[PDB]
Design a protein around this ligand. Structure first.
Ligand SMILES: N#Cc1cn([C@@H]2O[C@H](CO)[C@@H](O)[C@H]2O)c2nc[nH]c(=O)c12
Ligand SMILES: N#Cc1cn([C@@H]2O[C@H](CO)[C@@H](O)[C@H]2O)c2nc[nH]c(=O)c12
Length: 291
């Protein structure tokens, strides 16, 4: 990819944006996994470089085999089918991207992208800005996680593409024994998948004192309950050994884990979550919403 010392000398194009346009576009970017590790300044540079395009039902945004696209489209509204060898294989919806496979891996269009709503509105980024300012360590990050994610039970229903979309939004964090991964009573912004080690979940008894609920270990996840039910954290999660986690921000939860939300909701039937069911029944938490 692009030499990082040279990427610093790249100036993206700027197409003047109103404040309202900037707000709209940056919200799309901050919830799309391709931009997960860009800072605010760089998000806004990328937004400034984008241009709007619209399409109608049955238009092809790109067609398998084309070498003349080389653009990244982030969907504001509308849906499109991904068509391989005449078969619909995936549905792209609002906030998602098309064209990233070709830009990341430098190949002609792999699949046809065909609009299936009445209209579709997208924001479009050029290849050079994507390669110089966005792509970064995307391939290395995917290498860091894909083999692990292929072995995680709750992700078994995701295909390779979807597992890699999750990987795009992950970073790693390690904890020594006794360090708190999650504290009770906080906004609850982070979901952790345990790559190694064991944790304990600590609730509160009727007198308000800490009480151990259960343990989790490699392959398990913590932090999803607040994301599902929009409340502040209701337990501490503490490392009981050295722990290595993969970490996902709440802003990427819908895009990355949307397809497994019904799997995550199965915790209601798991005896390890009896304590939480009582939290919900008695209303023992206050709200917290995604930013
Ligand atoms: N092969 C393939 C796929 C291509 N795409 C998309 O189509 C655009 C044009 O190929 C890509 O830049 C993606 O955005 C896929 N999306 C979900 N699952 C898939 O398997 C594929
Ligand atoms: N109340 C409660 C519980 C909380 N958690 C976890 O702690 C994180 C922070 O609350 C959650 O996002 C879960 O990951 C629980 N895990 C198992 N059983 C439980 O009853 C609870």
């Amino acid at each position: 990819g692009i030499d990082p010392e040279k990427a610093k000398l790249y100036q993206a194009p700027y197409f003047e944006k109103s404040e309202d346009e900037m707000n709209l576009i940056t919200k799309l970017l901050t919830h799309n996994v391709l931009f997960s590790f860009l800072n605010t300044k760089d998000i806004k540079v990328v937004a400034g470089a984008m241009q709007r395009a619209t399409f109608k039902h049955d238009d092809c945004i790109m067609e398998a085999g084309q070498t003349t696209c080389n653009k990244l489209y982030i969907i504001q509204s509308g849906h499109a089918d991904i068509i391989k060898e005449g078969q619909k294989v995936y549905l792209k919806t609002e906030g998602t991207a098309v064209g990233e496979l070709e830009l990341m891996y430098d190949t002609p269009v792999v699949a046809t992208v065909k609009v299936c709503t009445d209209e579709l509105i997208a924001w479009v980024l050029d290849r050079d800005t994507y390669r110089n300012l966005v792509m970064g360590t995307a391939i290395r990050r995917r290498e860091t996680y894909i083999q692990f994610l292929a072995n995680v039970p709750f992700l078994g229903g995701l295909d390779s593409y979807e597992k890699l979309q999750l990987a795009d939004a992950l970073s790693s964090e390690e904890f020594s024994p006794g360090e708190y991964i999650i504290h009770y009573g906080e906004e609850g912004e982070w979901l952790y998948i345990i790559m190694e080690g064991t944790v304990e979940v600590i609730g509160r008894d009727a007198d308000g004192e800490p009480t151990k609920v259960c343990e989790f270990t490699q392959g398990d996840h913590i932090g999803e309950l607040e994301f599902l039910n929009n409340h502040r954290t209701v337990a501490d999660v503490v490392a009981t050994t050295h722990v290595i986690t993969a970490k996902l921000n709440r802003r990427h939860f819908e895009m990355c884990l949307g397809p497994v939300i019904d799997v995550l909701k199965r915790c209601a039937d798991d005896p390890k979550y009896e304590y939480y069911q009582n939290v919900l029944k008695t209303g023992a938490a206050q709200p917290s919403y995604v930013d």
